[PDB]
Design a protein around this ligand. Structure first.
Ligand code: 4WI
Ligand code: 4WI
Lengths: 306, 306
């Protein structure tokens, strides 16, 4: 028992990080087979990033202008192209440590692990959620761009995020591995509007199930509710609507604990209307929404990866 | 910016995990050079663990009774010995992925990353603190024993923890890599007394500095205090005494932010006496004590590892 914020093991991704330098700008790249993927603003000077024309800047670059280093070994760049907001550098050497992998675009509310890197070297690993407003609350410093987010399925690494930028309130934004931004953002140093964020209801419910599995059961009440009535109450507290798809995804946790999803919704409704009365759930004094139903299952049932 | 619970990258440790089976009991082992380290209760049946005589049980085992698997490859055991609560299995093959490493015994209040494993395979990574009562609040299921805790310094893995047992309130206990337990515990399935836990004061202060570095500054007051006067107040709230050694360790964060350690102590004192008035610090509604001063520095300054 016990329940912690848990990341995927990072080793398979560690084997793919390199550093990419163009002129005087250095950031991280992801080396898979004979291609290195990295954020396109590696080609910018500081002045360029206030209003860059990326197509124009790349025109004046040739292959040899990109210094790619995998450890102390330089990887010769033999081609390059730009795909939305990422650059793809073809190199003369395939990465022998390339894992089985896919590029996926995750949905809001879904979680992933981030391997935060500087100069091509890993610094740490943490877990994040894609917020409903398509930001993430990460931890990133200068030089972190090209750090990736991922999930693991047995032996397959699903890469879902590459880091590009920080809005001055500690809110982070980036792209999938095809270079398309999550959310209505662009890779330019200028002020930009994000949507109001909301609470990921299905994840809160998953975490309440984790609490029950771990013996923290005080908030369970004797009532049920309808899905409509719960959603009306949750709207007022800036919670996302709970859909039948969400109810179906919660089925394994409901079956394991013997608590109907709508009964847990009745317990959450009381918590929203009355507060926690100074109490904690799984050590937290707030309702936690960055654990998915699968996160709870893989932690509480010990799923491993090859 | 941003501040998250961050683990060390786990790849170097992933390369060292194997599974160890003796009879019908299977758990994890740590394979370094030509030695596999694992908890000694791998030699027990379920009945044995209620009151085991480990020396007696090991007498009747020979090398061939230990099945060690590194992936799908069996490692031939060619010798064995027991060191306190860990077994050491000599194998005929040195692990080619052995990193630079040390075995260290950490002090209470110090943190480490745990790579939770089942059947020799990694499931996830999370960060833990050695509590003042020598327990940890981990997340561990059946088969997790032999999972290790560690810190990383550039390229050197400092192994500090191997997991052995859970007390029925989700409290975990284990040994250093010489098999000596942290705390007054033994590897027997019987009820055992742990000390009252306390709050790690120097870590709370480190986390308040992390808050200031990230722009969360509302709790800073205009007062200072003496070390004596602060410790008198913190005693009442079950906080560990703050020592001059602690004050010295906080120096880098104090210098970076320009807030004297005793001035931060004055701010913490007000928080203890008055509460947070419904407010959060770095997203938390409680004071957090599982970040060390070094944890804050390595996250907020982007220290990497080879
Ligand atoms: C990549 N190495 C960095 C990661 C940043 C650095 C500080 N925290 C992070 O996450 N990415 C950048 O520096 C990008 C990059 C130009 C400027 N930038 C920003 O993140 C800036 N933010 C924005 O411009 C805003 F607000 F629109 F998001 C900055 C003010 C420097 C934090 C480009 C090409 C967007
Ligand atoms: C190693 N694979 C497991 C890890 C346990 C399993 C559940 N959560 C964990 O952390 N270690 C054990 O099963 C050890 C082992 C016998 C029994 N045991 C326990 O952890 C038990 N706890 C205690 O006996 C207590 F309370 F004293 F800590 C159990 C009740 C099964 C949780 C031995 C040899 C101690």
């Amino acid at each position: 028992s016990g329940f912690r914020k848990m990341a995927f093991p990072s080793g398979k991704v560690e084997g793919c990080m390199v550093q990419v330098t163009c002129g005087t700008t250095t950031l991280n790249g992801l080396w898979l087979d004979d291609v290195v993927y990295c954020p396109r603003h590696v080609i910018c000077t500081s002045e360029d990033m206030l209003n860059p024309n990326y197509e124009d800047l790349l025109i004046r670059k040739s292959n040899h202008n990109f210094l790619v280093q995998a450890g102390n070994v330089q990887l010769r760049v033999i081609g390059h192209s730009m795909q939305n907001c990422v650059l793809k550098l073809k190199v003369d050497t395939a990465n022998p440590k390339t894992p089985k992998y896919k590029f996926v675009r995750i949905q809001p509310g879904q979680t992933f692990s981030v391997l935060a890197c500087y100069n091509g070297s890993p610094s740490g690993v943490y877990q994040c959620a894609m917020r409903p407003n398509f930001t993430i609350k990460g931890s990133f410093l200068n030089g972190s761009c090209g750090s990736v987010g991922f999930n693991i399925d047995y032996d397959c690494v699903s890469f879902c995020y590459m880091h590009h930028m920080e809005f001055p309130t500690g809110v982070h934004a980036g792209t999938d591995l095809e270079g398309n931004f999550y959310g209505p953002f662009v890779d330019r140093q200028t002020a930009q509007a994000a949507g109001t964020d909301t609470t990921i209801t299905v994840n809160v419910l998953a975490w309440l199930y984790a609490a029950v599995i771990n013996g923290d059961r005080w908030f369970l009440n004797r009532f049920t509710t309808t899905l409509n009535d719960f959603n009306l109450v949750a709207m007022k507290y800036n919670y996302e609507p709970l859909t039948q798809d969400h109810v179906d995804i919660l089925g394994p946790l409901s079956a394991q604990t013997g608590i109907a999803v709508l009964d847990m919704c009745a317990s959450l409704k009381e918590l929203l209307q009355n507060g926690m009365n100074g109490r904690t759930i799984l050590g937290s004094a707030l309702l936690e929404d960055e654990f998915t139903p699968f996160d709870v299952v893989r932690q509480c049932s010990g799923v491993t990866f090859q």
